[PDB]
Amino acid sequence: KNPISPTIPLDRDGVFHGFLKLPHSSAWGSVMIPLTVIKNGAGPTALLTGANHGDEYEGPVALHELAATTSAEDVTGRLIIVPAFNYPAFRAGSNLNRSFPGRPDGTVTEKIADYFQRTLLPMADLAVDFHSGGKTLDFVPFAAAHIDDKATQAACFAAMKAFNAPYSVELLEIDSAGMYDTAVEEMGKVLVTTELGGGGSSSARSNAIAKKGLRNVLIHAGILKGEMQLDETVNLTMPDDDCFVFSEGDGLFEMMIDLGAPVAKGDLLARVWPLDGQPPVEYRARRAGLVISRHFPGLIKSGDCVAVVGVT
Incomplete structure (x- = not known):
């Protein structure tokens, strides 16, 4: 058919x-x-x-x-x-x-x-x-x-x-x-x-x-x-939604960690610089593991994934 x-x-x-x-x-x-x-x-x-x-x-x-x-x-x-x-x-x-x-x-x-x-x-x-x-x-x-x-x-x-x-x-x-x-x-x-x-x-x-x-x-x-x-x-493994960190605003995107680098819960993953005097917005890891994914472009938007962490 x-x-x-x-x-x-x-x-x-x-x-x-x-x-x-x-x-x-x-x-x-x-x-x-x-x-x-x-x-x-x-x-x-x-x-x-x-x-x-x-x-x-x-x-x-x-x-x-x-x-x-x-x-x-x-x-x-x-x-x-x-x-x-x-x-x-x-x-x-x-x-x-x-x-x-x-x-x-x-x-x-x-x-x-x-x-x-x-x-x-x-x-x-x-x-x-x-x-x-x-x-x-x-x-x-x-x-x-x-x-x-x-x-x-x-x-x-x-x-x-x-x-x-x-x-x-x-x-x-x-x-x-x-x-x-x-x-x-x-x-x-x-x-x-x-x-x-x-x-x-x-x-x-x-x-x-x-x-x-x-x-x-x-x-x-x-x-x-x-x-x-x-x-x-x-x-x-990516066992939890705690492996994903999403951006809550727009700005210039500064990643702080190596793709593939180890990261503990609470470490700083990235900064987002506002394009209109205020300090940057910080995005921190919710689980320990390895950074396996990251936002690539220089600007980031609300809802974009900041980084992904893989466990063990």
Whole structure:
């Protein structure tokens, strides 16, 4: 019933670069989601999606590289690579993430979600969903697993530990309704998500974390050939709303602590300087742990998250 058709085969051996197309129609147009499929021999299937927003780049870079530099002989199984997952542009730098599960006779965004929900996701054994902070937030580079209700948690935790980013976060929040990550979690699939930076930029460190983590997870999954890279990692949890500090006003934003630095309950996280003589507003940690996220831009607004602290 769903009118989305790939310009390539999903089922044949080789390297294939194409699109998902729905004419949305004197057709006056179509939307095209770029995708690469690499299948060879026998094995599981990885569904890799780059970014839900246009200001995240670690994901899009790693997936562009993987899609361009991986041959069929390297794969045992199948990779479905969607470097850009941000409606409507579907290009890095340029609402689909609340339209799940969607419907075949619906919005353009619900037709796309219905395709991922009822065609792509069921045939996937592993999902890797790259995020990054975007323009507003900057994170320490971490991979995250969702342990739930189910028994797949040991499989997700294992995929995250294979990723082996410098930080490993355990989230037992099941994400809000309509999101893609919620669809994977609630289908019981193995899902690893990331936050590999932010600020609308990507360094060679964070790019390298993404490429290594991608290869590790695909090798661990038995899809890619090779030897894994394992470095140190710090395991973190966000168990309480006391991990989050929100700004109550606007001003010039002065962060006082290192991203990644230790912080005790009561320490000063940031100052907000008023732009109309008065002293600055102070924002202090409500729990001890590590600063894992911070407001990135120089100005901050009421309601913005000042910083996030991860425990142990």
